[PDB]
Structure 1
Amino acid sequence: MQPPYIQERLKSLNDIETQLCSMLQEASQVTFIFGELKRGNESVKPQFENHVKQFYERLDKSTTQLRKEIQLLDENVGTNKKALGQDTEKMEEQLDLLSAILDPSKSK
C-alpha cells in the first residue's frame, strides 16, 4: 500500500472536490430561492442571508485549502528499484516451496 502521507493528501483532495460539489449545490438552492424572493413572498427572506453567507464561506476556504496543497507541492520536492531485489525474493519463495516439498508431514 502507499505510504500514509499520500493517503492524507488524497483524502484532502477528495474533501476539496466534495466541497466544490457542495458549493455548486448551494448555488443551485440560492438560485432557486431568489426566484420566489422575486415572486413576492417575504417569509424565506431570512434564509437568503444565511444561504449567501454559507455559499461565500464555502467558496473561499475550499480555494484556500487547495492553495495550501499547491504550496505543499513547493516544499515536497526533494523529499525498477524493486527489480534490484526482485529476483532475490523470488529465490526465497522457491526455496520455501522446496522446504514444503522436502517435509512430507507439512503437505496436508
Structure 2
Amino acid sequence: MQPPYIQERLKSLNDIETQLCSMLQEASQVTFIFGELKRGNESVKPQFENHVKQFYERLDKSTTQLRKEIQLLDENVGTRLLPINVNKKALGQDTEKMEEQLDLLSAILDPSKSK
C-alpha cells in the first residue's frame, strides 16, 4: 500500500472536490430561492442571508485549502518520505523469487507439512 503521506494528501483532495460539489449545490439552492424572492413572498427572506454567507464561505476556504495543497507539491521534493536503498526492488525481484522457491522446496522436503 502507499506510504502514509499520500493517503492524507488524497483524502484532502477528495474533501476539496466534495466541497466544490457542495458549493455548486448551494449555488443551485440560492438560484432557486431568488426566484420566489423575486415573486414577492417575504417569508424566506431571512434564509437568503444565511445561504449567501454559507455560499461565500464555502467558496473561499476551499480555494484556500487547494492553495496549501500546491505549496505541499512544491515543498515535499525529496522531503518527509526520505530516500531508502535497503537492494532496490527492480533488481530484488531476483531475491524474493529466490526465497519463495526455496520455501516451496521445504514444503516439498517435509512430507508431514503437505496436508
SS at match of 2:42: coil
SS at match of 1:29: helix
What runs of 5+ residues in structure 2 fail to find an aligned partner?
A: 80-86
1:47-72 deviation per Cα after TM superposition (whole angstroms, max 9, x unaligned): 00000000000000000000000011
Residue 82 (structure 1) shift? 1.4
Residue 98 (structure 1) shift? 0.1
CA distance in 2, matches of 1:3, 1:78: 14
Residue 73 (structure 1) shift? 1.0
4+ aligned runs moved over 6 Å, structure 1: none
Of Structure 1 and Structure 2, which has the larger fraction of its residues in helix? 1
CA distance in 2, matches of 1:83, 1:71: 32
CA distance in 2, matches of 1:81, 1:17: 36
Residue 83 (structure 1) shift? 1.8
RMSD: 1.2
The TM-score, its normalising length taken from structure 2, stands at 0.91
Residue 4 (structure 1) shift? 0.9
1:20 aligns with 2:20: yes
CA distance in 2, matches of 1:86, 1:45: 68
Question: % of aligned pairs identical?
Answer: 100
Aligned residue-pair number = 108
CA distance in 2, matches of 1:82, 1:9: 25
1:57-101 deviation per Cα after TM superposition (whole angstroms, max 9, x unaligned): 000000000000001111111229412211101100000000000
Greater CA drift, 16-25 or 66-75: 66-75
